[PDB]
């Protein structure tokens, strides 16, 4: 699958 740049546009963590 095409690599793609940047990232998956993630959220930030919420504890465990």
Partner 1 sequence: QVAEHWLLQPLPEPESRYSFWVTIVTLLAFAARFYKIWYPKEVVFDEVHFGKFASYYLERSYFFDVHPPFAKMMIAFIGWLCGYDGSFKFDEIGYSYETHPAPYIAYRSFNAILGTLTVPIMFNTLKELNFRAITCAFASLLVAIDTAHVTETRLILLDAILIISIAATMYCYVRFYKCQLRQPFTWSWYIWLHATGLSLSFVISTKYVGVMTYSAIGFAAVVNLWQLLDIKAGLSLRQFMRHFSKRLNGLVLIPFVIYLFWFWVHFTVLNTSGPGDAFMSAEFQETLKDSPLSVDSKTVNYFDIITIKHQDTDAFLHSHLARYPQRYEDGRISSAGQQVTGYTHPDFNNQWEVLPPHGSDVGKGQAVLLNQHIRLRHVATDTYLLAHDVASPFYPTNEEITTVTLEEGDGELYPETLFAFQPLKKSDEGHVLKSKTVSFRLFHVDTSVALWTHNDELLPDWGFQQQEINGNKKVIDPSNNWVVDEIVNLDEVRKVYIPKVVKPLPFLKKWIETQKSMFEHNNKLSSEHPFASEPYSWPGSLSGVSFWTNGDEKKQIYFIGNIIGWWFQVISLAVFVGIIVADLITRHRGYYALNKMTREKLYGPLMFFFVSWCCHYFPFFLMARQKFLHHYLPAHLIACLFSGALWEVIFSDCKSLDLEKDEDISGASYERNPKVYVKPYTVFLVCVSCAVAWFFVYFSPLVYGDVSLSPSEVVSREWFDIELNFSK
Closest contact distance (angstroms) between CB of 11 and partner 1 is 5
Q: Site map for partner 1, 1-16, x if CB under 8 A?
A: xxxxxxxxxxxxxxxx
* Distance between CA atoms of residues 8 and 6, nearest Å: 7
* Distance between CA atoms of residues 11 and 9, nearest Å: 7
* Distance between CA atoms of residues 4 and 16, nearest Å: 29
Closest contact distance (angstroms) between CB of 10 and partner 1 is 6
Closest contact distance (angstroms) between CB of 1 and partner 1 is 3
By the criterion CB under 8 A, which residues form the site for partner 1?
A: 1-16
């Amino acid at each position: 699958t095409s690599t793609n740049a940047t990232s998956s546009s993630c959220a930030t963590p919420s504890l465990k």
